[PDB]
Amino acid sequence: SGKPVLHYFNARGRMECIRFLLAAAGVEFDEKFIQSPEDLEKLKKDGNLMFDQVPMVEIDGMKLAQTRAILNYIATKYDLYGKDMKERALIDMYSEGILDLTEMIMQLVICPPDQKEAKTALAKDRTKNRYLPAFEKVLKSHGQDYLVGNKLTRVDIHLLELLLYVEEFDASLLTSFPLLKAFKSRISSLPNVKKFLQPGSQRKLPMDAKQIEEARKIF
């Protein structure tokens, strides 16, 4: 089989979603954490990062970089990419909006302190008046347990991850989304997911303060 090698900083960043996807597929993986600028330079020196950047996953003989390229690949091979040409349109259109808000939130602990409060208000607004209603809409439309195809797919995992971050951001934002709430429980309960959520796994912690400082050396 071969255990994929993920290269990244000891942080969620962009690799987090990849970690989540792999674990959900029940595929064990090895990681090499970039801990020093040296590590990174050495990494680049090897000529294995197509654009001198990470994420980069060694898998099936490829040195696949680019978050979406990696995820996309993993999704197909582990049948987490739906049944056909239209389901993926849905999955695709559902994952990107999920990526959007994710970044939106990320920014919060990265922006000029002078403007945090305002960005946060926007993020909350967006979260509850744009994103959540959208996904909730999707669930309410078919009443089935999975977002697409009534079969587990990558967005289900992606949605879970986002919901977990929204819960870390402002938990009250999720209290008016029943099906989403229920969804979170369901997906979280999946054996693979549960294991990953259990402490002692490759899931990385949220950043800020402690992590903000460590970023101020390499990330």
Ligand X SMILES: N[C@@H](CCC(=O)N[C@@H](CS(=O)(=O)O)C(=O)NCC(=O)O)C(=O)O
| Residues at the contact surface with ligand X, assessed by CB under 6 A | 13-14, 52-55, 66-67, 96, 100, 219
What is the Cα–Cα distance from 94 to 177, expressed in whole angstroms?
17
44 marked ligand binding residue: yes
- Using CB distances below 5 to 8 A depending on partner kind, what does residue 54 bind out of a second copy, ligand X, none? ligand X
Which of 199, 103, 182, 104 lies closest to 147, judged by CA?
Answer: 182
The H-or-E segment that residue 5 falls in is: strand 5-9
Please report how many Cα atoms fall inside a 13 Å half-sphere around the Cα of residue 173, on the Cβ side: 24
Question: For the residues of 103-150, what is the DSSP string, one character each?
Answer: HHHHHHTTS-GGGHHHHHHHHHHHIIIIIHHHHHHHHHHH--SSSSTT
57: its two tokens: 């996953």
- 12 or 88: CB nearest a second copy: 88
End-to-end Cα separation, the chain, in angstroms: 31
The residue from 85, 112, 199, 209 that contacts a second copy (CB under 8 A) is 85
Token pair for residue 135? 């996904």
CB of 44 or CB of 210, closer to a second copy: 44
- In angstroms, what CA-CA distances link 173 with 6, 58, 126, 154, 166? 33, 38, 11, 23, 7
Annotated ligand binding at 54? The verdict is: yes
Q: Residue 158's binding partner, choosing from a second copy, ligand X, none, with beta-carbon cut-off 5 to 8 A by kind?
A: none
Structure tokens at 16: 């987090």
Residue 157 vs 193, nearer CB to ligand X: 157
Residue 78 binds a second copy, judged by CB under 8 A: no
Query: Is 52 near a second copy (CB under 8 A)?
Result: yes
What does the block give as tokens for 20? 């989540």
Chosen residue from 24, 54, 67, 174 binding a second copy by CB under 8 A: 67
* Nearest in space to 31 (alpha carbons), one of 3, 68, 50: 3
The sign of the torsion formed by the CA atoms of 32, 36, 39, 44 equals positive
Point out which span in 7-15, 22-30, 93-101, 110-118 binds a second copy (CB under 8 A). Answer: 93-101
Q: Considering the rule CB under 8 A, would residue 134 count as an interface residue with a second copy?
A: yes
Picked from a second copy, ligand X, none, the partner binding residue 88 (CB below 5 to 8 A depending on kind) is: a second copy
Q: Is 66 annotated as a binding residue?
A: yes
Which of the listed partners (a second copy, ligand X, none) does 62 bind, with a CB threshold of 5 to 8 Å by partner kind?
A: a second copy
**Residues comprising the binding site?**
8, 44, 53-54, 66-67
Residues that bind a second copy (CB under 8 A): 50-52, 60, 62, 64-70, 72-73, 76-77, 85-86, 88-89, 92-93, 96-97, 100, 130-131, 134
